Amino acid sequence: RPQGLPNNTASWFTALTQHGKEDLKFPRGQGVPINTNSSPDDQIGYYRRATRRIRGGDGKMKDLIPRWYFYYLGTGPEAGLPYGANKDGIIWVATEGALNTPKDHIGTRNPANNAAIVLQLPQGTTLPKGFYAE
Ligand SMILES: [Zn+2]
Ligand SMILES: [Zn+2]
Incomplete structure (x- = not known):
């Protein structure tokens, strides 16, 4: 049963x-x-x-240090999870006017082709203390 290379598991962001x-x-x-x-x-x-x-x-x-990576809905390791599904290590986020559909057209990053883009949040976003983008 032939097997191809696994689907890209990297987040587009740092x-x-x-x-x-x-x-x-x-x-x-x-x-x-x-x-x-x-x-x-x-x-x-x-x-x-x-x-x-x-x-x-x-x-x-x-690195004992917890690191959190953003994936669009319907992409990444939890691609099959519907929005709001409760799981330890999963935090759901959505901007106003977003559509509840998989973002397969954006997908995930292949590290051998593209570098991660620096994770940036809009001006004045309430980020908990001690969290920093890499
Ligand atoms: Zn798009
Ligand atoms: Zn750091």
């Missing part, structure tokens, strides 16, 4: 790192990163806390 002790959350209408090449319909998705698979020879540790 990490939102939890450098403090606050739990990640956003007010309703906030959280979606800036993407000038996306429509109002596309402004919806989730932050997913990065999980550990196979990075640890001497460590069996990686």
